[PDB]
Design an enzyme around this catalytic site. Structure first.
Site: not given
Ligand SMILES: CC[C@@H]1C[C@]1(NC(=O)[C@@H]1C[C@@H]2CN1C(=O)[C@H](C(C)(C)C)NC(=O)OCC(C)(C)CCCCc1cccc3c1CN(C3)C(=O)O2)C(=O)NS(=O)(=O)C1CC1
Ligand SMILES: [Zn+2]
Length: 193
Positions: A71, A95, A151, A153
């Site tokens: 992502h 992901d 922010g 991730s």
């Protein structure tokens, strides 16, 4: 047109007794490096702060592989001293994306502790206690507004020994309050590998 490369713009220092973020590259430099894929900066540590032209997040080194979220990264190459480096791992279903770990970085060891008392490392170098609730989730001991996690991730979930337990994927949020976190377990990484 071509999309830029993901660019390392900093890191989370966990070397000493104090966790703090460090910016190693500013915005114009980032913009340029993204376009060229040529990054000559010295890379240090486990936790990198990364960027695209549009987004900023984290990337984590585990077993000689710099890991992050799809992502955030998409299928993008990563900027290196010798030019853009192609992804060695790409998994949209998880992901998850990965590139060979950059020279200078240090990698975390996958946890084998089977322990549920964890620690989440944010982009702001905040060390957040998290209790493991399942294969993929964990609750925050002190919940936080979504803003605080945004922010992050691509960052790690660590065990008390410092082993890597997983990669922060998504937040469990209710009306802007994050009470839990959702992550990519390290076993998934080991399997991908
Ligand atoms: C704000 C801090 C968030 C950590 C963070 N992640 C996200 O923002 C991710 C990206 C997107 C949404 N999301 C969420 O956290 C959302 C939320 C809060 C935005 C509402 N949560 C959710 O849906 O939970 C629901 C839950 C059921 C728990 C999902 C489980 C499955 C999760 C899942 C499994 C497999 C594939 C995919 C997913 C989710 N996934 C793809 C995907 O694309 O999710 C981030 O910080 N992003 S970032 O800012 O750094 C960005 C620049 C990179
Ligand atoms: Zn461990």
């Amino acid at each position: 047109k071509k999309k830029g490369s993901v660019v390392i713009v900093g890191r989370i220092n966990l070397s000493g007794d104090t966790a703090y973020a460090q910016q190693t590259r500013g915005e114009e430099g980032c913009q340029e490096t993204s376009q060229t894929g040529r990054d000559k900066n010295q890379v240090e540590g486990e936790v990198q702060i990364v960027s695209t032209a549009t987004q900023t997040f984290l990337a984590t080194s585990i077993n000689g592989v710099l890991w992050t979220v799809y992502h955030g990264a998409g299928t993008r190459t990563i900027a290196s001293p010798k030019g853009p480096v192609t992804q060695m791992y790409t998994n949209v279903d998880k992901d998850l994306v990965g590139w060979q770990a950059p020279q200078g970085s240090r990698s975390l060891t996958p946890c084998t502790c089977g322990s549920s008392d964890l620690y989440l490392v944010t982009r702001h170098a905040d060390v957040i206690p998290v209790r493991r609730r399942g294969d993929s989730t964990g609750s925050l001991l002190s919940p936080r507004p979504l803003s605080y996690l945004k922010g992050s991730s691509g960052g790690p979930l660590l065990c008390p020994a410092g082993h890597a337990v997983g990669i922060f994927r998504a937040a469990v949020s209710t009306r802007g309050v994050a009470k839990a976190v959702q992550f990519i377990p390290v076993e998934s990484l080991e399997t991908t590998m």
